[PDB]
Amino acid sequence: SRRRQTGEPPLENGLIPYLGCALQFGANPLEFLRANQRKHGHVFTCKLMGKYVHFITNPLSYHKVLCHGKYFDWKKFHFATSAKAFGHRSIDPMDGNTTENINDTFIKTLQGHALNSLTESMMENLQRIMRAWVTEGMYSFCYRVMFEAGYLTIFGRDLTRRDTQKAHILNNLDNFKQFDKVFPALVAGLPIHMFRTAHNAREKLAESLRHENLQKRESISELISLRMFLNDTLSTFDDLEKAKTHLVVLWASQANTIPATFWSLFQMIRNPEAMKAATEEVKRTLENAGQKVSLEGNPICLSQAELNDLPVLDSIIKESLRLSSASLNIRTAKEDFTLHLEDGSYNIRKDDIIALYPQLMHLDPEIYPDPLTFKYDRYLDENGKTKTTFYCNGLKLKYYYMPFGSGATICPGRLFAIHEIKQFLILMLSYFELELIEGQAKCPPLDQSRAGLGILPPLNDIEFKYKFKHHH
Amino acid sequence: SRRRQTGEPPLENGLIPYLGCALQFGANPLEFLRANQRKHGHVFTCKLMGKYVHFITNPLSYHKVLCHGKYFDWKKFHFATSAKAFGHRSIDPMDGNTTENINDTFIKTLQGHALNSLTESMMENLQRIMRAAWVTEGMYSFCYRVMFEAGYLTIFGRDLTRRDTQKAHILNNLDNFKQFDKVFPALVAGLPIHMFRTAHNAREKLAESLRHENLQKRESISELISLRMFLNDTLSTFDDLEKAKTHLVVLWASQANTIPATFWSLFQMIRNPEAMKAATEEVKRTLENAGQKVSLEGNPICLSQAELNDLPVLDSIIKESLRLSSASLNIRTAKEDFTLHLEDGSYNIRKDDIIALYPQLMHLDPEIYPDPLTFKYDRYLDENGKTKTTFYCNGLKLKYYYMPFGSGATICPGRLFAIHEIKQFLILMLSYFELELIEGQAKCPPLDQSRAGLGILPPLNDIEFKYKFK
Ligand code: HEM
Ligand code: HEM
């Protein structure tokens, strides 16, 4: 058993299998982390996921962890977790299965010219999918629409199989739901065969993502066409493993985007001021880009710049994620060393984890007054432009909004994710009349079973009503 | 990391913090163990609760694990688990904190002469609590109120200084017990109690009420608690709080299985008309010719140990209810490296490995119990209407076929009292009340497997029933 040595942080004994564990018994990961802050101050160590995990919780010390330090390994833990959860051999080039740098592949094909073609394809796919009042769970609606749109955008479409396209997508959606469901457990080292349904779901998704089946598809993303090419040319992976590297991309493209979309839609519709400000901005932008909206007419086309210069939508989305983001931001100690923070100096052993839990900052009332209130204009300045000035103890923060991470540990899809959510909100507002069945119903609590994993979904779905607009 | 070596069982890769973990993600502990049987056969090793746990799932090998084995330590894990969940220093006499043997203390105060007084007191306490409109209520919630209070008063006595506020003391303890017990599957697994703020305060408020200074104010305390106070004071160097926590252990053990056991026994009996009829007829016979009349505004019913014991219909109804709800992990620790010889073969076990049975697997085995998921109220009755003790597996007569109280030295010291209290409760319900379910044709609730490993599993949801004084 491990004992706190000299200069080491306070050590909380107790095994925490994973952050969302024991939710059914009344566990609350956020409040648990807060309670340790009060007990131990801003740096403490938990036995978390079979690791020793040093939480750094002072917003003003974040920059000391997010810089490219000499004793930080920002990939080891991620690579190992991906292997476990998806079931493939290591993709760390250091283990000799590939010479590919997957991060460069993501950056290369998720930004620049590639991003433009993704964005354009998503807009086209969203309109094909989205074109009386219908009542439905809002999460379930966002799941259908966004899953299909994102799947077809990243993995292209099977045009030989047109009439069985809705069957294939519904199977995939269902399989994805069942696999993603158990993901918090998988990351933690719990065996997938404890989850027979999720295990079958996973392998069925992997099957559908074998190169043999992806070669039948057209308008495949540049990301997946390149990843196929480098699987083939730079790795000694077998055919199933290859399929699972594409499953890693399916999961990453989907697991945060779906709940982010829900929250952004829910929070807009729920708050009449947000809805009015969003509705006007979208009208103004479509009007003077000359884009007509109709169900049967020609599609809408928006420039990168027109999509990007939507500050109200950006603020709505940022505020939605400030409230729902629950990532564990992680790196591993390359060796024994001393970490120097504003809070003091702490000795860290080799292979210890150094973690941030930025939800603690996002909900900090010192940085964000009334932190639990959705303020649609929170990230707008006096000019109605995107606001970038936020403070802690009078000091201007470099890191204050982190739902995509930061540094080298940063979502390569982040610009695309924002584009796709903006596109969805644009189309929802343009195409439909929208009402909450319970306009006064409390906001669902976050479901903290996925704490650590990204954007948290609602604990319960909420019903809403939608109706195609008539344009006069 | 550990690998499977020569002669060791199949080693399952994967961390399992506790058996009821990840239920929210669709885990199912019973089916998980069955799936391992199928894949690996009757002996397999899981990384469970931070240990390497060898499961022995062939019923014909149970006898080789349950015998007083020279290679087994049947107390090490329990002592350590108790210390963690309740928050006290080791009670293992090897660790110098006490020289008391608590097993002997339990046996001495829960059986023999001591059992007579416990049984009498419970029957008195039950009657005081249970004594004309139809009242509708959740059946589990009802069994919880009544059995918790009856059992708390029987074990810990009554404060007669403050009769007018006793209902309030009991209600606070009841609520505090619920909150502490809710988190118990996590605690045994090593999850920290302070991760459950409400349960932690609840645990500590219960402990406060069971300090010797507060127990001293109480009267008609059980010989169990009196003797345990005595041996705390004379045989240990425990502090005042630790002394309270040793009494909290007993509160928990006396309550956590009895409450769900009672619910299942009542529910199963009301829901199955042939069971209700058989139980009603038997109870009346026994009261009649023990010369005991039943009235609300009358004198207490008194039954001997023999009269209570010779109730085979009630005994079968209780056994069959536990056959269907019992989910204990029966554990012992390997004192050293050794070879375990089973019907299945021979397996090398390491020092500090756990050897586990999960008897729910045998209780629900269709080879032993035809139609295992059906409650047959006469399943433990023979042709003669007396207790049936002959059950077979592959044509071999089983020594171990009904194990909800455990067996061997790892056996509930309170089992006789437990059956009496449930019999007494069922006798009084039949005697006092008209009873019916709101949905008599409604489905049986599923077991709640978040508590898998811990004893009798409660229903996942409560069910409503109506009652009325006759
Ligand atoms: C609101 C939507 C999204 C959010 C909040 C989000 C957030 C994140 C976060 C926090 C990480 C982990 C970074 C770290 O390790 O610290 C990540 C990684 C990643 N994200 Fe996103 N993401 C979103 C959508 C997307 C989309 C649409 C894609 C497009 C394919 C994507 C692709 C990826 C990939 C491939 C990684 C793995 C990075 C690596 O280890 O090389 N994400 N994302
Ligand atoms: C239906 C009701 C009950 C059931 C099914 C039950 C079952 C069990 C089981 C399975 C064990 C662990 C056996 C092992 O070590 O393998 C146990 C232990 C224990 N039981 Fe019960 N029990 C019940 C009610 C009671 C009652 C009413 C009491 C009253 C005091 C009680 C007192 C205890 C105690 C003190 C232990 C700890 C044993 C030790 O460490 O010496 N139980 N019980």
Read out DSSP for A205-260?
HHHHTSHHHHTT-BS--HHHHHHHHHHHHHB---HHHHHHHHHHHHHHHHTTHHHH
A198 and B12: CB-CB below 8 Å? no
Please report how the helices B273-289 and B312-325 are oriented relative to each other, as an axis angle in degrees rounded to 10.
Answer: 140
- The token pair that represents B387 in the structure block: 């207790």
- Taking the C-alpha atoms of residue A15 and residue B459, their distance in angstroms, rounded to an integer, is 28
Alpha helices by DSSP H, B3-42: 29-40
Put simply, whether B35 touches A (Cβ < 8 Å) is: yes
Q: Which residues are paired to A48 by β-bridges? A: A16, A51
Q: Backbone breaks in chain B (C–N > 2.5 Å) follow which residues?
A: 131
The secondary structure of chain A in percent helix, strand, coil, rounded to multiples of 5, reads 50, 15, 35
- Taking the C-alpha atoms of residue A366 and residue A237, their distance in angstroms, rounded to an integer, is 50
Q: For chain B, what is the radius of gyration of the CA atoms?
A: 22
Cα-to-centroid distance, B425 and ligand 2 (Å)? 19
Q: For residue B390, with 0-12 CB atoms within 10 Å meaning exposed, 13-18 middle and 19 or more buried, which class applies?
A: exposed
Q: Which residues of B touch A182 (CB under 8 A)?
A: 22, 25-26
- Taking the C-alpha atoms of residue A375 and residue A273, their distance in angstroms, rounded to an integer, is 9
> Residues with Cβ < 8 Å from A334, sequence gap 6 or more?
A70, A71, A72, A73, A350
- Taking the C-alpha atoms of residue A428 and residue A131, their distance in angstroms, rounded to an integer, is 10
- Taking the C-alpha atoms of residue B457 and residue A339, their distance in angstroms, rounded to an integer, is 48
CB A44 within 8 A of CB A54: yes
- Residue A286's Cβ-side half-sphere holds a number of Cα atoms within 13 Å equal to 20
Q: How many helices (H) and strands (E) does chain B have?
A: 18, 17
- Taking the C-alpha atoms of residue B207 and residue B156, their distance in angstroms, rounded to an integer, is 13
Residue B272 CA, distance from chain mean position = 23
DSSP string, A331-363: EEESSSEEEEETTEEEEE-TT-EEEE-THHHHT
Residue B206 CA, distance from chain mean position = 20
Which residues 374-413 of B have a C-beta within 8 angstroms of A?
none
DSSP label at residue A140: H
A25 and B194: CB-CB below 8 Å? no
- Residue B101's Cβ-side half-sphere holds a number of Cα atoms within 13 Å equal to 4
Residue B466: CB atoms within 10 A of its CB come to 15
- The token pair that represents B59 in the structure block: 């019923």
- Taking the C-alpha atoms of residue B54 and residue B44, their distance in angstroms, rounded to an integer, is 6
**Rounded (10°) CA dihedral B360, B365, B369, B372:** 80
Stretch (H or E) spanning B338: strand B338-342
> Residues with Cβ < 8 Å from B374, sequence gap 6 or more?
none
CB A246 within 8 A of CB A151: no
- Taking the C-alpha atoms of residue B367 and residue B393, their distance in angstroms, rounded to an integer, is 6
- Taking the C-alpha atoms of residue A288 and residue A281, their distance in angstroms, rounded to an integer, is 11
- Residue B446's Cβ-side half-sphere holds a number of Cα atoms within 13 Å equal to 7
Resolution to 1 decimal place, in Å: 2.2
Residue A60 CA, distance from chain mean position = 24
The secondary structure of chain B in percent helix, strand, coil, rounded to multiples of 5, reads 50, 15, 35
DSSP string, A396-418: EPS-S--TTEETTEE-TTHHHHH
Q: Could you tell me if residue B406 is left (phi over 0), alpha (psi between -120 and 50 degrees) or otherwise beta?
A: left
Does ligand 2 come within 6 angstroms of the Cβ of B74?
no
Provide the experimental method for this PDB entry.
X-ray
- The token pair that represents B298 in the structure block: 């009358």
User: Residue A15 is nearest to which of B26, B190, B196, comparing CB atoms?
Assistant: B190
Q: Where are the beta strands (DSSP E) in A109-232?
A: 134-137
Alpha helices by DSSP H, B43-101: 62-66, 76-82
Sign of CA dihedral A310, A313, A317, A323: positive
- Taking the C-alpha atoms of residue B423 and residue B307, their distance in angstroms, rounded to an integer, is 11
CB B43 within 8 A of CB B57: yes
CB B207 within 8 A of CB B252: no
B25 and A189: CB-CB below 8 Å? no
Shortest alpha-carbon distance between residue B83 and chain A (Å)? 13
Sign of CA dihedral B7, B10, B14, B19: negative
- Taking the C-alpha atoms of residue A247 and residue B196, their distance in angstroms, rounded to an integer, is 36
For the domain A1-472, what is the CATH code?
1.10.630.10
A194 and B50: CB-CB below 8 Å? no
Is A411 annotated in a binding site? The answer is: yes
Q: Which of B146, B132, B140 is closest to B425 using CA atoms?
A: B146
Sign of CA dihedral B235, B238, B241, B242: negative
Q: Which residue of B has its CA nearest to A16?
A: B191
Q: Backbone breaks in chain A (C–N > 2.5 Å) follow which residues?
A: 131
- The token pair that represents A325 in the structure block: 């983001």
Pairing of the two strands B354-357 and B51-56: parallel
Which atom of ligand 1 lies closest to the CA of A403? 5
Alpha helices by DSSP H, B96-239: 102-110, 113-130, 139-156, 166-182, 184-188, 197-209, 212-215, 223-235
B198 and A13: CB-CB below 8 Å? no
Give CA separation, A219 vs A106, A121, A372, in Å.
18, 9, 42
Q: Which of A408, A410, A354 is closest to A56 using CA atoms?
A: A354
DSSP string, A292-311: ---SSSPPP---HHHHH--H
- Taking the C-alpha atoms of residue A458 and residue A176, their distance in angstroms, rounded to an integer, is 18
Give CA separation, B46 vs A80, B49, B348, B353, in Å.
21, 9, 15, 10
Place domain B1-470 in its CATH homologous superfamily: Cytochrome P450 (1.10.630.10)
Query: Which of B1, B21, B23, B200 best probes binding to A when mutated, by most A CB atoms within 10 angstroms?
Result: B21
- Taking the C-alpha atoms of residue B268 and residue B374, their distance in angstroms, rounded to an integer, is 10
Query: Residue whose CA is closest, atom 3 of ligand 1?
Result: A256
Which residues 1-20 of A have a C-beta within 8 angstroms of B?
12-17
Which atom of ligand 1 lies closest to the CA of A223? 30
- Taking the C-alpha atoms of residue B104 and residue A102, their distance in angstroms, rounded to an integer, is 64
